[PDB]
Nucleic acid binder design. Structure first.
Ligand SMILES: Nc1nc2c(ncn2[C@H]2C[C@H](O)[C@@H](COP(=O)(O)OP(=O)(O)OP(=O)(O)O)O2)c(=O)[nH]1
Ligand SMILES: [Ca+2]
Ligand SMILES: [Ca+2]
Ligand SMILES: [Ca+2]
Ligand SMILES: [Ca+2]
Length: 342
DNA sequence: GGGGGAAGGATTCC
DNA sequence: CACGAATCCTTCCCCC
């Protein structure tokens, strides 16, 4: 069958910051996203393991991080930089297999089925790849290897950080019955709970439930997905993913429902969005708002043609107005998203 | 009954 | 509650 090798870069953003300023190694490093509402308002994008040991991780408020680690190194997120480093590493991987799926800024899958035979050679190829990336970009990564993408990923999670692991056909059979359903990619907290209310704590448990009831609880796609995995039949092909949308969203100094007060933020979002679009022309635009109670509302429109900067501006305000008149809540974050590229 | 789209929301965290 | 992008779901709507 198919042999998949998954690469996931270790504590990536923070590690890139270490590569660019080596003295940082050994010290707790936290990459922050400062919202500008107040001094250290915002959240953590990621932290290195020195910092994670004490509970400082992605998603917690920067303020909470500083209470725990007042003397750690706090850096503003520099996405562009991390993206360029990522691209280079992806190019190196692209040399080990043409069948590659760049799943995100820091992970990719390679179909090495006709590149090696048996897991042994696969394992050796993983070490070659780890060594090559460490040598070329001084970045440590974790390799996951199995028969399909979901398990290759799971193997990497199990080997984090700077590890490599193979989950052979026998171990998969074991995991299908031993693994906590919540540790399965695609199963967030909302799905974990529904599956719990169904008596489904492991993958195998999805086989002892009437499909119709499963489908009714979590949806058909997710249901067929889990059953497929449980039947040891999951086998999605590794394929090139293409960017389908580009957008920007900013946090406003203060929460507001005032149009003239919100426009500047919206227009700044549009400007960045367009620059990032580069030479892409979208036919669809969506105005996205995050309300005072962290809920997310959006309004959009598809055009029978490409959207120009002027159009985007004009339309953005109409969609923003539609949002204000339709949701009595104050707006905290405002932005845009362009999709359906020509 | 059913295709095809579009819109807005749900969920994931890749 | 203290920060970008993909996929899937429900609800409409138009119409063969
Ligand atoms: N802004 C923001 N960025 C995130 C968040 N989560 C992840 N990222 C970014 C920065 C992370 O370094 C990068 C890769 O995510 P990972 O889940 O693989 O974590 P990282 O690679 O940081 O740690 P790891 O060694 O894989 O456990 O994506 C988040 O919650 N907010
Ligand atoms: Ca990673
Ligand atoms: Ca990752
Ligand atoms: Ca989970
Ligand atoms: Ca994550």
């Amino acid at each position: 069958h198919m042999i998949v090798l998954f690469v996931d870069f270790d504590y990536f953003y923070a590690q890139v910051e270490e590569v660019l300023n080596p003295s940082l190694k050994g010290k707790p490093v936290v990459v922050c996203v400062f919202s500008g509402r107040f001094e250290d308002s915002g959240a953590v994008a990621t932290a290195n393991y020195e910092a994670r040991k004490f509970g400082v991780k992605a998603g917690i408020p920067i303020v909470e991080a500083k209470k725990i680690l007042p003397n750690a190194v706090y850096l503003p997120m520099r996405k562009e930089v991390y993206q360029q480093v990522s691209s280079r590493i992806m190019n190196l991987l692209r040399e080990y297999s043409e069948k590659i799926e760049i799943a995100s800024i820091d992970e990719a899958y390679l179909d090495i089925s006709d590149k090696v035979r048996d897991y042994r050679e696969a394992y050796n190829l993983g070490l070659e790849i780890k060594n090559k990336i460490l040598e070329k970009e001084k970045i440590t990564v974790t390799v996951g290897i199995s028969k399909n993408k979901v398990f290759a990923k799971i193997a990497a999670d199990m080997a984090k950080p700077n590890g490599i692991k193979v989950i052979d056909d026998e171990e998969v059979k074991r995991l299908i019955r031993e693994l906590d359903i919540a540790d399965v990619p695609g199963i967030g907290n909302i799905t974990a709970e529904k599956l719990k209310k169904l008596g489904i704590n492991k993958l195998v448990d999805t086989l002892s439930i009437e499909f119709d009831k499963l489908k009714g609880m979590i949806g058909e796609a997710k249901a067929k997905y889990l059953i497929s995995l449980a039947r040891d039949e999951y086998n999605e092909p590794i394929r090139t993913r293409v960017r389908k949308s580009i957008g920007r969203i900013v946090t406003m100094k203060r929460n507001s429902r005032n149009l003239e007060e919100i426009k500047p933020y919206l227009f700044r979002a549009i400007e960045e969005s367009y620059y990032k679009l580069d030479k892409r022309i979208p036919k669809a635009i969506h105005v996205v708002a995050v309300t005072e109670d962290l809920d997310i509302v959006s309004r959009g429109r598809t055009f029978p043609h490409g959207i120009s900067k002027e159009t985007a501006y004009s339309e953005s305000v109409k969609l923003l107005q539609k949002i204000l008149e339709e949701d009595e809540r104050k707006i905290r974050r405002i932005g845009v998203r362009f999709s359906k590229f020509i």
